[PDB]
Design an enzyme around this catalytic site. Structure first.
Site, PDB file in Angstrom:
ATOM      1  N   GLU A  88      42.946  18.865  30.921  1.00  0.00           N
ATOM      2  CA  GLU A  88      42.350  17.571  31.224  1.00  0.00           C
ATOM      3  C   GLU A  88      43.393  16.423  31.123  1.00  0.00           C
ATOM      4  OE1 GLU A  88      38.567  16.568  29.022  1.00  0.00           O
ATOM      5  OE2 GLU A  88      37.506  18.138  30.186  1.00  0.00           O
ATOM      6  N   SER A  93      27.505  18.675  36.174  1.00  0.00           N
ATOM      7  CA  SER A  93      28.644  18.922  35.301  1.00  0.00           C
ATOM      8  C   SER A  93      28.229  19.547  33.998  1.00  0.00           C
ATOM      9  CB  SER A  93      29.345  17.630  34.950  1.00  0.00           C
ATOM     10  OG  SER A  93      30.610  17.965  34.421  1.00  0.00           O
ATOM     11  N   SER A  94      29.038  20.518  33.486  1.00  0.00           N
ATOM     12  CA  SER A  94      28.752  21.137  32.174  1.00  0.00           C
ATOM     13  C   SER A  94      29.409  20.209  31.152  1.00  0.00           C
ATOM     14  CB  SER A  94      29.363  22.517  31.985  1.00  0.00           C
ATOM     15  OG  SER A  94      29.345  23.328  33.172  1.00  0.00           O
ATOM     16  N   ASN A  97      30.789  15.907  39.563  1.00  0.00           N
ATOM     17  CA  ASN A  97      29.866  16.979  39.751  1.00  0.00           C
ATOM     18  C   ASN A  97      28.451  16.507  39.423  1.00  0.00           C
ATOM     19  OD1 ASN A  97      28.604  19.759  39.358  1.00  0.00           O
ATOM     20  ND2 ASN A  97      30.442  20.520  38.316  1.00  0.00           N
ATOM     21  N   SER A 141      36.561  20.119  36.783  1.00  0.00           N
ATOM     22  CA  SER A 141      35.158  19.806  36.884  1.00  0.00           C
ATOM     23  C   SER A 141      34.794  19.881  38.349  1.00  0.00           C
ATOM     24  CB  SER A 141      34.935  18.393  36.376  1.00  0.00           C
ATOM     25  OG  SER A 141      33.560  18.053  36.361  1.00  0.00           O
ATOM     26  N   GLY A 142      33.740  20.601  38.649  1.00  0.00           N
ATOM     27  CA  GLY A 142      33.388  20.707  40.031  1.00  0.00           C
ATOM     28  C   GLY A 142      34.174  21.783  40.737  1.00  0.00           C
ATOM     29  N   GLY A 157      39.802  23.515  32.331  1.00  0.00           N
ATOM     30  CA  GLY A 157      41.230  23.770  32.284  1.00  0.00           C
ATOM     31  C   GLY A 157      41.855  22.496  31.649  1.00  0.00           C
ATOM     32  N   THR A 166      31.050  27.240  36.561  1.00  0.00           N
ATOM     33  CA  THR A 166      29.716  27.596  36.183  1.00  0.00           C
ATOM     34  C   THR A 166      29.082  28.437  37.281  1.00  0.00           C
ATOM     35  OG1 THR A 166      29.608  25.617  34.783  1.00  0.00           O
ATOM     36  CG2 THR A 166      27.551  26.744  35.178  1.00  0.00           C
TER      37      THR A 166
HETATM   38 MG   LIG Z   1      30.400  23.833  34.811  1.00  0.00          MG
END
Ligand SMILES: [Mg+2]
Length: 745
Positions: free
Chosen positions: A454, A231-232, A228, A180-181, A452, A185
């Site tokens: 977690e 974040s997605s 993030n 994340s981060g 990826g 994206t």
């Molecule tokens: Mg993302």
């Protein structure tokens, strides 16, 4: 043109700066050094220990400390030659350690060179600061160039994918994973930007709508987290479609694992989905009241994290954009009213306060919030109400109303809010595909943007899923690499099935014997089963019985799975519920009949309102299987996005943070993997060049090259194994190149 123009930004921002010196001579130095740890406790730390004395077995070396130690020769993390510092592909390195890998990543990163190849992979380290390498002018430079031709860059992998598509008439894929981060994206948007440029409608309508989808998805599926600001909270597979001519014909989006829970709860400092905030910042003073809108501080769903805004973000201004994008893709003004009404109502339902008192069941003293939800949803309050606190339930014969206590009542309200939101997100996606999708398409380039592995403090059902997906993607990689070898060493004149990933995979998804998900499904049919029966069943079948499983010494609610990236401990709290993902039927009924035209769809469309009925785990296994099949039909590309540290700061590349990711993402495996063979597999005309002088015979640019190659080896009088003669390239084992380049003129 910038490629040749050492003064261009291309050179500035994408390449390691060069001087008019070429010397293997300039490079020159009189000694030979290594990679050590000044404290074996913290192993990701290392210093460069000048080797001072050698033996036959080990090696003595001097420390930064001044001191002197000794290491095994077979334990040595030999430092590559300084010449190598900054190479574009680590596949070029002689010594392939870990610190050696980190070092090259670092040397680059210190120069702001965030992209590096590692064999098959493109490694990208978040700089945490803006780097202007994504301009149209930057786009233009990548056009039609081979990977070997330009500097590492997302644009580069995208162009290679595109030419391969056109060239091989084969579909392609880009797998972009990591923390994340990490920049997943971001990189994905660039892929599409680039594709749209090199293949869209000359200056596009579709192109714009394709472009305009992200922001719609981001307002709804993105949120601020500690990791993030954007974040997605969902995974995606974007398929960019082309006609045989190579022009963009359409697109399609597949979403996965949307974090519905965030709607009703956010950790401290975090935010709920962006849209909530945009809605309340950008609606008109006049849409509000219309929606009975107030501020975030006035809503339970938004006033608990303590965070309601983002630094450098104007929710009102970002809302224009969103609304804009809706307009472009083609959302009817009235389709848009309803989307906002839903968001609003959801905002209202969270404002509902159940009180007990009366007896044992809950009650609605104040109907303010209720009313408001019902209004905006286009549903009949007393029904909703009734559905919330007194839902009819079967006793086989007996369809009878139960009176829910306050908590049970609350959870239901929550379940309702979550269904609303996930269904909505679904609908948005469909609706977008509807506009962008092509029934008629020749080829496609697909982009997978998902996390990826977690491994958190607390790992639940959702982590298992993502982790399961990761085991499959990791197996695909390994396999792919295995194949790129099997038929291929057999291309330049070189020599010489079951996955280690299978067991883990089986433990999770096996049917017979049943793996975790199957037993989970089993336990799911019994209404009276619990987290305890469940966890009991898993230990019963795998404790001391399956090598990738571990029953905790003490915890009674967790179990461990030995994953690719290592052991992950999971907690089963709420797994039965998560697997069923229940919603009271009367609730469904309440909403099935709704004035709102958008609402009706969410509850009336079996494609949206229903799973199959299969479980959540069954559906996940299935969509993971569909995804892979697709992948199986493509020529893939792998991008590994890395966060430099956990603090969201630039100029701070932490060896531990990083290596850990390198370890878990398969970058480190692949290395050691080729490490075994012949990694360095240089070009003939390419060796004699930098190595015609180290041989009292050989001259620069000649004709009889591979022969010339023979020379230096001869002059250098080398052994039959450190090297290999392969039609095109001279295959070199590890350190061969080091030693070699390490000779005199
Ligand atoms: Mg993302």
């Amino acid at each position: 043109n910038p490629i040749h123009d050492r003064t261009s930004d291309y050179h500035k921002y994408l390449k390691v700066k060069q001087g008019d010196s070429d010397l293997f001579k300039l490079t020159v130095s009189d000694k030979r050094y290594i990679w050590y740890n000044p404290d074996p406790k913290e192993r990701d730390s290392y210093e460069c220990g000048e080797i001072v004395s050698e033996t036959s077995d080990s090696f003595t070396f001097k420390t930064v400390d001044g001191q002197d130690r000794q290491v095994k020769k077979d334990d040595a993390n030999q430092r590559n030659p300084i010449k190598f510092d900054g190479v574009e592909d680590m596949s070029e390195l002689s010594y392939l350690n870990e610190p050696a890998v980190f070092h090259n990543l670092r040397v680059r990163y210190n120069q702001d060179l965030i992209y590096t190849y590692s064999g098959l992979f493109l490694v990208a380290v978040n700089p945490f600061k803006r780097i202007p390498i994504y301009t149209q002018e930057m786009v233009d430079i990548f056009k039609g160039r081979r990977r070997n031709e330009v500097a590492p860059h997302i644009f580069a992998i995208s162009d290679v994918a595109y030419r391969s598509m056109l060239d091989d008439r084969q579909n392609q894929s880009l797998l972009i994973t990591g923390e994340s981060g990490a920049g997943k994206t971001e990189n994905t948007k660039k892929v599409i930007q680039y594709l749209a440029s090199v293949a869209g409608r000359n200056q596009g309508v579709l192109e714009q709508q394709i472009l305009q989808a992200n922001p719609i998805l981001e307002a709804f599926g993105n949120a601020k987290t500690t990791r993030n600001n954007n974040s997605s909270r969902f995974g995606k597979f974007i398929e960019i479609q082309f006609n045989n001519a190579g022009f963009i014909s359409g697109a399609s989006i597949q979403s996965y694992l949307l974090e519905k829970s965030r709607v009703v709860f956010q950790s401290e400092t975090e935010r709920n989905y962006h849209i909530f905030y945009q809605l309340l910042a950008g609606a008109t003073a006049e849409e509000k009241k219309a929606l009975h809108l107030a501020g975030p501080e006035s809503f339970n769903y938004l006033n608990q994290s303590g965070c309601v805004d983002i630094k450098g973000v104007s929710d009102s201004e970002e809302f224009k954009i969103t609304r804009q994008a809706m307009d472009i893709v083609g959302f009817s003004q009235e389709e848009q009213m309803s989307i906002f009404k839903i968001i609003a109502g959801i905002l209202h339902l969270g404002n509902i306060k159940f009180e007990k008192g009366a007896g044992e069941g809950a009650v609605l003293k104040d109907k303010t919030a209720l009313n408001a939800a019902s209004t905006v949803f286009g549903v009949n309050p007393s029904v909703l109400e009734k559905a919330l606190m007194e839902p009819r339930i079967l006793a086989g014969r007996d369809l009878v109303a139960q009176h829910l206590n306050v908590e049970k009542s609350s959870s239901s309200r929550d379940a309702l809010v979550k269904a609303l939101y996930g269904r909505l997100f679904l609908w948005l996606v469909k609706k977008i595909n509807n506009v962008l999708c092509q029934e008629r398409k020749a080829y496609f380039i697909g982009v997978l943007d998902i996390s990826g592995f977690e491994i958190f403090k607390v790992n639940s059902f959702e982590q298992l899923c993502i982790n399961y997906t990761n085991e499959k993607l990791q197996q695909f990689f390994n396999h792919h690499m295995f194949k790129l070898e099997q038929e291929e060493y057999l291309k330049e004149k070189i020599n010489w099935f079951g996955l280690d990933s299978q067991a883990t995979i089986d433990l999770i998804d096996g049917r017979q014997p049943p793996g975790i998900l199957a037993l989970l499904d089993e336990q799911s049919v019994f209404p009276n089963a619990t987290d305890n029966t469940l966890i009991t069943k898993l230990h019963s079948h795998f404790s001391k019985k399956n090598a990738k499983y571990e029953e905790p010494r003490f915890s009674k609610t967790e179990f461990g799975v030995t994953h690719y990236a290592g052991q992950v401990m999971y907690e089963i709290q709420d797994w039965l519920e998560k697997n069923k993902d229940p919603l009271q039927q009367d609730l469904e009924l309440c909403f099935k009949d709704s004035s709102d035209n958008v609402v009706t769809k969410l509850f009336n469309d079996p494609n949206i309102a229903s799973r199959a009925f299969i479980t959540v785990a069954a559906q996940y296994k299935e969509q993971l299987a569909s995804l892979m099949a697709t992948l199986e039909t493509t020529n893939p590309h792998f991008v590994r996005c890395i966060i430099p540290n956990n603090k969201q700061l630039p100029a701070k590349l932490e060896d531990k943070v990083v290596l850990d990711q390198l370890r878990c993402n398969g970058v480190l495996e692949g290395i050691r993997i080729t490490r075994k063979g012949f990694p360095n597999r240089i070009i003939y005309a390419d060796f004699v060049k930098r190595y015609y002088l180290l041989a009292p015979n050989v001259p620069r640019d000649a004709e009889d090259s591979q022969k010339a190659t023979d020379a230096v080896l001869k002059h250098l009088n080398i052994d039959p194994e450190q090297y290999r003669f392969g039609i095109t390239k001279i295959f070199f084992r590890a350190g061969q190149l080091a030693r070699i380049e390490e000779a005199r003129e």
